[PDB]
Structure 1
């Protein structure tokens, strides 16, 4: 229709960009300055997940609203098939700091074979990364100095990237397959930040010691974006979707969050903790032993009063939505199944939108609208209060009033952003692991 905008796709990442053969897992975010940041996995040896790859994190920026993009940079690169996989972007509006978080595995490890726990040990009230030698002896890293089990200083030190130094000379990296001292083979959550609008980034912080429990095997970023709460008692809290497995391998979603501008982090409960299933059975993420109630990758949005909604990948075939009254610390016992939105067991994107649509607060949603990874569809969901919970809190559901096919054929992971002009940017997997496509759409298009 006249005035509708749906730009022709641009291959924002593609084979050969930054000398990477493959790409997957988009994240897209507009900074407070108006810059678009796109992050992605630069998968160097094909499309496969860790551990069958060597994956780096790449970033591109656009200062002109997505019309032109920079030459990119690699911001995290570990050696020897140690991978960083699944990025997420968020910003602290009060400081201007941009955060990127990602899951990190040492060489040989990934989702399926992650070891139990954080990889840290408490010594006299501080958490220290453990290292292991060839015989299984345990060491700790204390302010980047390696101590043996008897609390004697060794000749080894580390840095934030895991390089291993013997008397100040680099000999290996604790994430490699060859180092004489290795980190535990499990997932770690890495955090980097930028104070210059994404131009430069810090070296990673390993926040596992704060967010990963002793009974979790995998704990990973749920890729896409986070939020900063705008309304209510938890205003300012930075919320980052995650998911984990228990000792039985079963997956549950959650959020990690920070009340101090990213300095310290906490993991909240899962919606699977004290979840009431359809006919009244109560489960818990620690004990979940069945595949059917699993909740995996997820993205979060905020309701007008500050209530959180966690949109989750799951095994029901349809969207699942959890509700939190307390800023992501806990969730209501009922997980909604929204049978108006197919969910083929794939990542999804959902964002708040800044302007009302048809008199209602609205969200924008993207996923493959099928029983397979196809029929990529962007939706406008109008928020309606439908009653109240027993505790008096408002109960909100979505009216998926506008639903637009944007990508016939293959469509897998995606990430949305609102643009400075009120339009919508979208970065999506329109191929399995090669070209990653960026488009801009306006609401005239989406509503047509």
Structure 2
């Protein structure tokens, strides 16, 4: 259909533009679509881009508006006092502000559908809300509407929500256009999606991105595919991967690197209201926080992640049990059988389930997928699905049988309810992943697993050594393998904070010299240095010049392959803010060869200081551009839970950063 109105290049400079004469007599019927291309790189705290209002005294609550906040939130109001209707729909973190120094042209599509009684908002090709109501209010059937406005809402003759920005294009249609038609509207996005709602993972949410550039030039990414909203474990979460063979321009359909089947892979719209938003999947096993490295020796790609048994997360994991029994300098996974009060079993060589009370083997074995076999035959359990049909979260059996896994709630044999680390490998650079194996405990029988630092592991230039940073109370625990991940040893490095989420990432400054940058509880990013390929570690220092919150955020870090200003360069990615996870920056540091000190010389702002930026992944692409995959929202904020399609990917050149 044709638009009933189309206009453009409106500058909103804290003074509204009246388009009543052009628009109001064109509005007809009860369904409308608004399409708007706009920029706002310096928005006011709360501002309206478009308004339709009754501007008369006594009718201040009769208006429709499309509004935004300087947090990046988008929303609408639809109000009529005579009808007794006051709708407010919005979603945080829906907008872009600036990219590479330039204001971003956001593409907004709002559909008001009287027949389905549904209001739907898309921004930049992403559906940010879709709300169905019992009593529908058509946006141009509000009582006594007499003003159509850009850059404010006229209430009782005064300009409310004055906007700073520009509306380069605005069209309106007397029709609710289909999702199909919506997808044909050209976009001007500065980003792309790798993982997204509706893809092969069927997770509606994603967090904890990684990126790693392989020797073939293929670029690999991993992520938490989070099913039960954006919550950390306990939940249902799988690890998914995708790769690009063309310097990040296009990405493969995701596959799983690590997955559990005890719960169905459901795409669910997790509730965001204050009563239900903390609803949390409570009986599923999960994986969380992945990290990738490539091994020179075998050519294999290696991926580690934390593993949580059914209903377990960092909050309730048994801190005083590794889940393994030491028997002769060897560690065996402990198991509890249905009905026993203690763990009277172990998994020994070739997966034989052994009875500890009698040191007899049983007729049970554990296969390579940690599935239970009796006499060589597969045992099964019934799968669960989740729903909010009753008005609160329910988890119930769905009729489907899946292989019985020792990490499952319904298993005959169950592992210790604590956290573990697993590894899987790929022989084809991420086209398929092997079945995962658990790493051994590194801090003794009576200490829970360390926590893997998400991002990249480190492959040293001059050897086959592989290192993965992990953290626990009071230290960083580096996991080191010299044999393609077949065996591991730890190298502990004390840090002066207890209870820190000390997520750490490493760069090799020069041969055998490793600097680790890590999250702390001090509001500053810290670092330590090894000069013997991770064997021993220095005291902890801090970076001034970058601020984090008291709780901190993951920091990603790479060593750039090319000189910058004639010097070796390190690039950090992190929010730069004392207040929240926002103000994303890449920070370029030049190395002083005299003492390996780093002078942080350039700060590139990824978007506005007030727009969200949390966990991130960076990697040097084979063409020497920088790829960044990041959480574009505040993943700490309890107001920004359960948002879809906020983990986004951008491509930057060094000239953009300097």
Query: How far off its partner does 1:74 sit?
Result: 1.6
| Structure 2 partner of 1:283 | none
Query: How far off its partner does 1:318 sit?
Result: 1.0
Counterpart contact for 1:242–1:255, Cα < 8 Å:
yes
| Structure 2 partner of 1:446 | 657
Distance 2:527 2:412 in 1: 46
Call closer, same or farther: CA 1:410–1:340 in 2, change over 3 Å.
same
After TM superposition, the structure 1 = structure 2 runs for residues 17-28 of structure 1, keeping only pairs within 5 Å, are: 17=199, 18-28=201-211
Query: How far off its partner does 1:105 sit?
Result: 0.8
1:202-254 Cα offsets, whole Å, 9 max, x none, are 11011134x343353341210000111124xxx32111111123xxxxx5323
| Structure 1 partner of 2:195 | 13
The structure whose RCO (Cα within 8 Å, separation 6+) is larger is 1
Call closer, same or farther: CA 1:170–1:212 in 2, change over 3 Å.
farther
| TM-score, length basis structure 2 | 0.60
| Structure 1 partner of 2:69 | none
Which of 376, 386, 390 is matched with 2:584 structurally?
Answer: 376
After TM superposition, the structure 1 = structure 2 runs for residues 185-264 of structure 1, keeping only pairs within 5 Å, are: 185-209=417-441, 211-231=442-462, 235-245=463-473, 251-264=474-487
Counterpart contact for 1:350–1:366, Cα < 8 Å:
yes
Distance 2:427 2:649 in 1: 25
Deviates more, 1:91-100 or 1:53-62: 91-100
Which of 325, 329, 345 is matched with 2:535 structurally?
Answer: 329
- Alignment of 1:361 with 2:568, yes or no, is yes
Counterpart contact for 2:575–2:581, Cα < 8 Å:
yes
Distance 2:582 2:220 in 1: 26
Counterpart contact for 2:421–2:451, Cα < 8 Å:
yes
| Structure 1 partner of 2:506 | 300
Counterpart contact for 2:364–2:373, Cα < 8 Å:
yes
Counterpart contact for 1:407–1:430, Cα < 8 Å:
no
- Alignment of 1:30 with 2:30, yes or no, is no
| Structure 1 partner of 2:125 | none
Number of residues paired by the alignment? Answer: 409
Deviates more, 1:161-170 or 1:137-146: 161-170
* SS of aligned partner of 1:445: helix
- Alignment of 1:434 with 2:644, yes or no, is yes
Distance 2:439 2:477 in 1: 16
Which of 487, 491, 508 is matched with 1:268 structurally?
Answer: 491
Query: How far off its partner does 1:4 sit?
Result: 9.7
Q: Which has the larger radius of gyration?
A: 2
Distance 2:220 2:479 in 1: 22
Distance 2:196 2:443 in 1: 34
* SS of aligned partner of 2:596: strand
Which of 405, 428, 436 is matched with 1:173 structurally?
Answer: 405
Which of 96, 99, 108 is matched with 2:299 structurally?
Answer: 96
- Alignment of 1:77 with 2:308, yes or no, is no
Query: How far off its partner does 1:385 sit?
Result: 4.2
| Structure 2 partner of 1:396 | 596
Q: Which runs of 5+ in 2 are unaligned?
A: 1-99, 105-188, 264-283, 381-403, 636-642
1:311-360 Cα offsets, whole Å, 9 max, x none, are 0100111110111122223312x211111122330101001111111111
* SS of aligned partner of 1:331: coil
1:132-156 Cα offsets, whole Å, 9 max, x none, are 1232142011121111012212121
| Structure 1 partner of 2:90 | none
- Alignment of 1:156 with 2:338, yes or no, is no
Q: Which runs of 5+ in 1 are unaligned?
A: 246-250, 278-287, 387-394
Distance 2:325 2:254 in 1: 37
Distance 2:329 2:572 in 1: 44
* SS of aligned partner of 1:214: coil
- Alignment of 1:130 with 2:130, yes or no, is no
Call closer, same or farther: CA 1:295–1:327 in 2, change over 3 Å.
farther
Distance 1:297 1:16 in 2: 30
| Structure 1 partner of 2:554 | 347
Which of 241, 245, 254 is matched with 1:59 structurally?
Answer: 241
- Runs in 1 of length 4+ with deviation above 6 angstroms? 3-7
Counterpart contact for 2:450–2:477, Cα < 8 Å:
no
Deviates more, 1:13-22 or 1:121-130: 121-130
* SS of aligned partner of 1:108: coil
- Root mean square deviation, CA, Å: 2.1
Call closer, same or farther: CA 1:117–1:331 in 2, change over 3 Å.
farther
- Alignment of 1:112 with 2:345, yes or no, is no
